């Protein structure tokens, strides 16, 4: 029996449902996982630290969960000191942090390749400051290297109570340079609000262009900008044409809404799919430990999280070295890792919006 810890934000209903589906689906014979679910906040680092020390008091071998941009350094510090691996579907970090395994591939390089394929020089970039500032620095460095005209504007500093005149003033100021082209980099809720306000002010006719910079391009509502005329591009990680993905959707849409909240959909969010893939990755790694006959068994006496000096236990160092030795096939396609913890040998589809719906035009990898 392997005891692990699980942290989930207050509001993550579909992700915990896909986690339950992955735990039922990937049950093995040699052992059994036991997640300790902590449904606390994600922005308040005090509650995150409390849940971290509560999971560390149980003596767990791995910790799964999300993190906010205001708590990324807290997670990397607390997981690098105590040498405990942390598997996450959240946004990638800026650096090679030990014991941090990530499920989201790079979005910056795919976006730069998409701009270099579309042969652009002047556009606007409406971003959000909740997943770091990595892509912003990347596109500003590429604009300095390629002599572009990027109008980079944050949108995350606007409240939900007066977001009608601020967006009107923003898209009125974007008409000063006559910007025919805007790249949107927002979360799954802000994209829908910006698209609804654009439809309200009427800026989705043929003559403009949009790019939804996320992995879940089909997660938003695209029936409202389907008949507009402005061709909209985006990136997709969950290819629905695969047999395993189609079987997972056929087993997903037939589920009960009351038994699994947010599961009676024809699609699925990308974070839920990365959670379902991370369950498979952890199951394959623990099965490789059960097959290599490595005894790391202990009890729930790991001590307090604030020990001075907090002494590590060396058998966890192999566990991250086990996690880098995992190359499987899941809803994100191929899963292969480096020595740091990033994802290698991945494939992201580039979706363009047609009249009949979303249509794929090609794929992108890091080796090509």
């Amino acid at each position: 029996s392997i005891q692990i810890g699980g942290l989930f934000p207050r509001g993550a209903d579909q992700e915990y449902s896909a986690f339950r589906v992955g735990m039922v689906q990937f049950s093995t014979s040699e052992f059994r996982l036991t997640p300790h679910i902590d449904n606390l906040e994600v922005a308040n680092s005090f509650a995150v630290t409390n849940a971290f020390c509560s999971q560390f008091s149980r003596g767990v071998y791995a910790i799964f969960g999300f993190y906010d941009k205001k708590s990324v350094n807290t997670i990397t510090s607390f997981c690098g000191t105590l040498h405990v691996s942390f598997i996450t579907p959240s946004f990638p970090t800026d650096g090679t942090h030990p014991f941090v395994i990530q499920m989201r591939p790079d979005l910056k390089g795919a976006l730069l390749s998409l701009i270099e394929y579309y042969q652009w020089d002047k556009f606007a970039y409406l971003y959000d400051s909740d997943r770091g500032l990595s892509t912003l620095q990347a596109v500003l460095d590429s604009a300095a290297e390629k002599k572009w005209q990027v109008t980079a504007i944050n949108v995350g500093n606007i409240n939900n109570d007066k977001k009608d005149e601020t967006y009107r003033s923003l898209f009125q100021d974007l008409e000063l340079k006559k910007e025919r082209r805007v790249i949107l980099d927002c979360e799954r809720d802000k994209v829908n609000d910006i698209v609804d306000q654009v439809i309200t002010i009427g800026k989705h006719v043929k003559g403009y262009h949009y790019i939804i910079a996320n992995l879940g391009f089909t997660d938003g509502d695209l029936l409202k900008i389907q008949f507009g005329g402005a061709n909209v591009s985006g990136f997709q990680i969950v290819d629905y044409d695969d047999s395993l993905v189609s079987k997972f959707i056929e087993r997903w849409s037939t589920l009960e809404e009351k038994e699994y909240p947010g599961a009676h959909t024809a699609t699925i969010k990308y974070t839920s799919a990365l959670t379902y893939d991370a369950v498979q990755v952890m199951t394959e790694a623990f099965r490789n430990l059960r097959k290599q006959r490595i005894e790391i068994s202990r009890r729930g006496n790991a001590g307090d999280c604030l020990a001075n000096p907090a002494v590590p236990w060396g058998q966890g160092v192999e566990i991250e070295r086990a996690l880098k030795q995992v190359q499987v096939e899941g809803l994100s396609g191929n899963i292969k890792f480096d020595q740091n913890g990033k994802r290698i040998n991945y494939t992201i589809n580039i979706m363009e919006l047609k009249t009949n719906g979303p249509r794929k035009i090609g794929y992108w990898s890091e080796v090509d």
Partner: antibody, heavy 119, light 108 residues
Framework: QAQLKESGPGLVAPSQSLSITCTVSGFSLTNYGVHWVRQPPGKGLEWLGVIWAGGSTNYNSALMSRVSISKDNSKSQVFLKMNSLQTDDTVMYYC?????????????WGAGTTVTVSS | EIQMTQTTSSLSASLGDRVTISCRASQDISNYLSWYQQKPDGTVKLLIYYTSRLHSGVPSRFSGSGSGIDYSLTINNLEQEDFATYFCQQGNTLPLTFGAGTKLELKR
């Protein structure tokens, strides 16, 4: 509502086979797992084995070479096969459904059938 | 393996009593235990999951508490449909050994 019903032959000879049929209704057997357990009269209930929704199956360590499980999702039936029966097999058999609700829990169980092994 | 035990074998209560049923284990299970009810015909259903929450379909009259190795189920008011066998099930390590089980009884 979900209901499970266990049935068997009841009277079986020693050192023979035993096929128990568990019929479940009110839910689907493609996304949940099944668990078969025994119950001795006057003693503690012991878990015989379990099968998952994805085809994975496990059993107890003492009689892993004596129990097998098959399933039919069209009839929502679970067939448990038990061989090498002895005189101490006059017990009850129950079948339950498993779920993840922050712990591996048994939600919907059955009535259980009485099997008496005698010659 | 992990041996589960229950001292109370037959409990006596009336209609409307807050009855408690305790359970102990061989070690700490970190509240990964469930409480289930089984009628006299043999049909068993779940009552309380993860030792503190209630499942969808059970009433709000039952609850649970406890920590470490000592858990407990609690009923605020006993009903006619509440006359059943209560069993505790641990889910820490394989094989999942269930509890001994207690049987409620009406006082007259």
């Amino acid at each position: 509502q979900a209901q499970l019903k266990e049935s068997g032959p009841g009277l079986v000879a020693p050192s023979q086979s035993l096929s128990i049929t568990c019929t479940v209704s009110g839910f689907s057997l493609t996304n949940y797992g099944v668990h078969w357990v025994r119950q001795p009269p006057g003693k503690g209930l012991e878990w015989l084995g379990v099968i998952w929704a994805g085809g994975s199956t496990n059993y107890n360590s003492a009689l892993m070479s004596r129990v097998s499980i098959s399933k039919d999702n069209s009839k929502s039936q679970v067939f448990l096969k038990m061989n090498s029966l002895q005189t101490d097999d006059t017990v009850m058999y129950y079948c339950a459904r498993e779920d993840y609700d922050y712990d591996w829990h048994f939600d919907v169980w059955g009535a259980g059938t009485t099997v008496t092994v005698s010659s | 393996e992990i041996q589960m035990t229950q001292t109370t074998s037959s409990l006596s209560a009336s209609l409307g009593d807050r009855v408690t049923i305790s359970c102990r284990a061989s070690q700490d299970i970190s509240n990964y235990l469930s409480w289930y009810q089984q009628k006299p015909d043999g049909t068993v259903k779940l009552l309380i999951y993860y030792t503190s929450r209630l499942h969808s379909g059970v009433p709000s009259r039952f609850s649970g508490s406890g920590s470490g190795i000592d858990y407990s189920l609690t009923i605020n008011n006993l009903e006619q449909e509440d006359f059943a066998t209560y069993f505790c099930q641990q889910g820490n390590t394989l094989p999942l050994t269930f509890g001994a089980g207690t049987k409620l009884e009406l006082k007259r």
